[PDB]
């Protein structure tokens, strides 16, 4: 079986980022095993859009994209595709047009190479004010992109109510760019979230399963 295997290693080593700084791994030509990756964690929920868990690990794609980040299970309610929670409003949104999955899993004691952050952080509001008109335009994050407020919010929220702001250049209107941090206490076992987005090619699907 020739082909380079998909390298899921970067998520096993280090601290998984916060949800608004989700780490993105793209796979274009791979042999992959999702069961192999998931046997390492204690999966809590595994919900998909326009695909099912059995089919997502069983098919060939033209590209496979894996987002992972620290995410507590206490906020499972706000992490869905059709969601209206603050997460899928200003923190992390995945594509409409593509088949999609959303995984919550806890990292067990068998894994001591994934380090913990001090706390769970997410952006509860990010909005933009114009100079001449102070009408607030909430920067609803676009699919597969980062919040514009990643430029001003740090890697981890320090206190639950922290407030971040940046003044904009007169090119873009000269307004103010503003964000609010919000925090969740870290748990004894780190909890994470994974996003999967896949593209089927019209001609070639080279990211193929283990067999």
């Amino acid at each position, epitope marked *: 079986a020739e082909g380079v295997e998909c390298d899921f290693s970067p998520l096993l080593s280090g601290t998984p980022p916060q949800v608004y700084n989700f780490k993105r791994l793209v796979f274009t030509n791979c042999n992959y095993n999702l069961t192999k990756l998931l046997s390492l964690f204690s999966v809590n929920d595994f919900t998909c859009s326009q695909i099912s868990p059995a089919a997502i690990a069983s098919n060939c794609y033209s590209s496979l994209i894996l987002d992972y980040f620290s995410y507590p299970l206490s906020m499972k309610s706000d992490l869905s595709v059709s969601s209206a929670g603050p997460i899928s409003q200003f923190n992390y949104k995945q594509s409409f047009s593509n088949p999609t999955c959303l995984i919550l899993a806890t990292v067990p004691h068998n894994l001591t190479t994934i380090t913990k952050p001090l706390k769970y952080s997410y952006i509860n509001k990010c909005s933009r004010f114009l100079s001449d008109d102070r009408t607030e335009v909430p920067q609803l994050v676009n699919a597969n992109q980062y919040s514009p407020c990643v430029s*001003i919010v740090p890697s981890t929220v320090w206190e639950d109510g922290d407030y971040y702001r940046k003044q904009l250049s007169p090119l873009e209107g000269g307004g103010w760019l503003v964000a609010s941090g919000s925090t969740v206490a870290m748990t004894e076992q780190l909890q994470m979230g994974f996003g999967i987005t896949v593209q089927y090619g019209t001609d070639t699907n080279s990211v193929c399963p283990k067999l």
Partner: nanobody, 119 residues
């Protein structure tokens, strides 16, 4: 709640100066504190600001010359000003934002200290 300023005085052009604003305020619910200045007959304009989250932001006329800092341990904010020029002559105020969101609309102001610059 009260804001008090120190450090104001006359300084010749190109020199340095530091103002300080201790907030003996009833509340710690200030989420940003800002420095403004009012030059003889110009609009009161924003010079520098620091926030709850520590994001620093400055007025459009200081070319890295001014630097704002806060130590929450002493309830005080410093504004160190370098390479001053006569155009920086104004009465400087420090201000606090309670539940501030977006453009600075300060809810408490200080009595203002005056800085003058002669060339």
């Amino acid at each position: 709640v009260q804001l008090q300023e120190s450090g104001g005085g006359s300084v010749q052009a190109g020199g340095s100066l530091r103002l300080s604003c201790v907030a003996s305020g009833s509340i710690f619910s200030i989420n940003a504190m800002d420095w403004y200045r009012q030059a003889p007959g110009k609009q009161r304009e924003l010079v520098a600001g620091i926030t709850s989250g520590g994001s620093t932001n400055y007025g459009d006329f200081v070319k890295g010359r001014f630097t704002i800092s806060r130590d929450n341990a002493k309830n005080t904010v410093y504004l160190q000003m370098d390479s001053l020029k006569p155009e920086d002559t104004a009465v400087y105020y420090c201000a606090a934002e309670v539940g501030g969101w977006g453009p600075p609309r300060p809810d408490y102001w200080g009595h203002g200290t005056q800085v003058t610059v002669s060339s």
